[PDB]
Amino acid sequence: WGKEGHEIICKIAQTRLDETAAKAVKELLPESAEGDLSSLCLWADRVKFRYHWSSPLHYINTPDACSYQYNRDCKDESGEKGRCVAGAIYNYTTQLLSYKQYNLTEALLFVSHFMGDIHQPLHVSYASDKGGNTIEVHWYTRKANLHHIWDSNIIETAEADLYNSALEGMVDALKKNITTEWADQVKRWETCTKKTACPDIYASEGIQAACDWAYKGVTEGDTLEDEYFYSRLPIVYQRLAQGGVRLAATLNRIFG
Numbered sequence: 001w002g003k004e005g006h007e008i009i010c011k012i013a014q015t016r017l018d019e020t021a022a023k024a025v026k027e028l029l030p031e032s033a034e035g036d037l038s039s040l041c042l043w044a045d046r047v048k049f050r051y052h053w054s055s056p057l058h059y060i061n062t063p064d065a066c067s068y069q070y071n072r073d074c075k076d077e078s079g080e081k082g083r084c085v086a087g088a089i090y091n092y093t094t095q096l097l098s099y100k101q102y103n104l105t106e107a108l109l110f111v112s113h114f115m116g117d118i119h120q121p122l123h124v125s126y127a128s129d130k131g132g133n134t135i136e137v138h139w140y141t142r143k144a145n146l147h148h149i150w151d152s153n154i155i156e157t158a159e160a161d162l163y164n165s166a167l168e169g170m171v172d173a174l175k176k177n178i179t180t181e182w183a184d185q186v187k188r189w190e191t192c193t194k195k196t197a198c199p200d201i202y203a204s205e206g207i208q209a210a211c212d213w214a215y216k217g218v219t220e221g222d223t224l225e226d227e228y229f230y231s232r233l234p235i236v237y238q239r240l241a242q243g244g245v246r247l248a249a250t251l252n253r254i255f256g
């Protein structure tokens with residue numbers, strides 16, 4: 001996701017931390033963050049070139065089908081197994097279990113960003129179109145690629161048009177629904193029988209959404225506007241809420 005999506009996910013997650021995880025996050029954040037995890041939830045995107053080995057860790061490339069399997073797909077262009085967002089999440093969550101050898105401030109920031117990215121449908125999608133990056137369309141009157149529409153345009157258009165430029169408005173509405181509309185599902189989103197995290201569950205859901213909602217109905221050159229926007233917005237809400245709820249559930253398991 002772009003900045004807004006990661007901020008939303010981290011804002012939701014930080015208010016769902018239990019006391020031991022809230023304590024560990026406050027201790028691991030640098031002073032400049034002023035205690036706010038969401039002020040650094042895009043840090044990982046800012047080291048894609050300084051730490052070039054980290055670039056493939058933001059997504060998963062799959063064959064053209066609605067299927068995801070860790071052993072088949074979690075590898076980078078060189079074929080090195082484990083170098084994809086699911087493998088990164090296992091890596092950095094395992095490093096945080098050592099909290100109170102690695103920089104754990106970086107592990108916390110990578111886990112926060114990657115838990116977000118693994119919930120963007122087009123970050124678990126086709127290698128053949130680079131996760132929709134090569135599908136060129138128009139978002140209303142402007143040129144955009146489909147990947148960027150999902151990382152940024154849908155959220156930005158909702159923030160301006162539906163929330164009158166208050167992104168805290170979108171956060172607040174998601175938090176209200178996590179409490180009043182989605183409570184039973186939220187309990188399932190939080191459940192993980194693994195030691196730490198369950199990224200393969202989230203990636204499987206994500207390629208299914210890429211097929212059914214993101215790629216669906218889209219052809220190079222189409223103009224995506226109100227019909228696509230209103231029909232896809234609920235899936236974006238769902239994924240941002242799942243990302244926030246799961247990031248908190250994971251950090252609570254790790255630090256507890």
Ligand SMILES: *[C@@H]1O[C@H](CO)[C@@H](O[C@@H]2O[C@H](CO)[C@@H](O[C@@H]3O[C@H](CO)[C@@H](O)[C@H](O)[C@@H]3O)[C@H](O)[C@H]2NC(C)=O)[C@H](O)[C@H]1NC(C)=O
Binds near residue numbers: 053092
């Ligand atoms: C798990 O997390 C660790 C910590 O961020 C990652 O370690 C980093 O791994 C990369 C290689 O993938 C290392 O870079 C390479 O280093 C060697 C020289 O040491 C150099 O020959 C290569 O050109 C490249 O720069 C990097 O140094 C290393 N960083 C640390 C602090 O250990 C690891 O990649 C992650 N694995 C995942 C997410 O699957």
Ligand SMILES: *[C@@H]1O[C@H](CO)[C@@H](O[C@@H]2O[C@H](CO)[C@@H](O)[C@H](O)[C@H]2NC(C)=O)[C@H](O)[C@H]1NC(C)=O
Binds near residue numbers: 040043103104
């Ligand atoms: C752990 O990693 C973080 C992020 O890479 C380091 O913090 C950065 O430190 C440099 C100076 O070395 C500053 O210019 C950056 O502003 C810092 N980034 C952030 C996000 O705070 C941190 O120093 C590392 N801790 C170590 C080496 O023990």
Ligand SMILES: *[C@@H]1O[C@H](CO)[C@@H](O[C@@H]2O[C@H](CO)[C@@H](O)[C@H](O)[C@H]2NC(C)=O)[C@H](O)[C@H]1NC(C)=O
Binds near residue numbers: 181
């Ligand atoms: C929170 O949930 C409410 C209720 O489901 C959502 O509002 C509904 O949105 C649908 C479109 O998905 C409309 O067709 C209904 O008319 C709305 N219902 C009501 C009572 O207004 C709302 O969009 C959700 N907000 C978030 C951020 O998830």
Ligand SMILES: Nc1ncnc2[nH]cnc12
Binds near residue numbers: 060122124130131132
């Ligand atoms: N190749 C790729 N596949 C999916 N998402 C991406 N984001 C940046 N590059 C990507």
Ligand SMILES: [Zn+2]
Binds near residue numbers: 001002006116117
């Ligand atoms: Zn992102």
Ligand SMILES: [Zn+2]
Binds near residue numbers: 002120123147151
């Ligand atoms: Zn992206």
Ligand SMILES: [Zn+2]
Binds near residue numbers: 001044045058113117
């Ligand atoms: Zn990213």
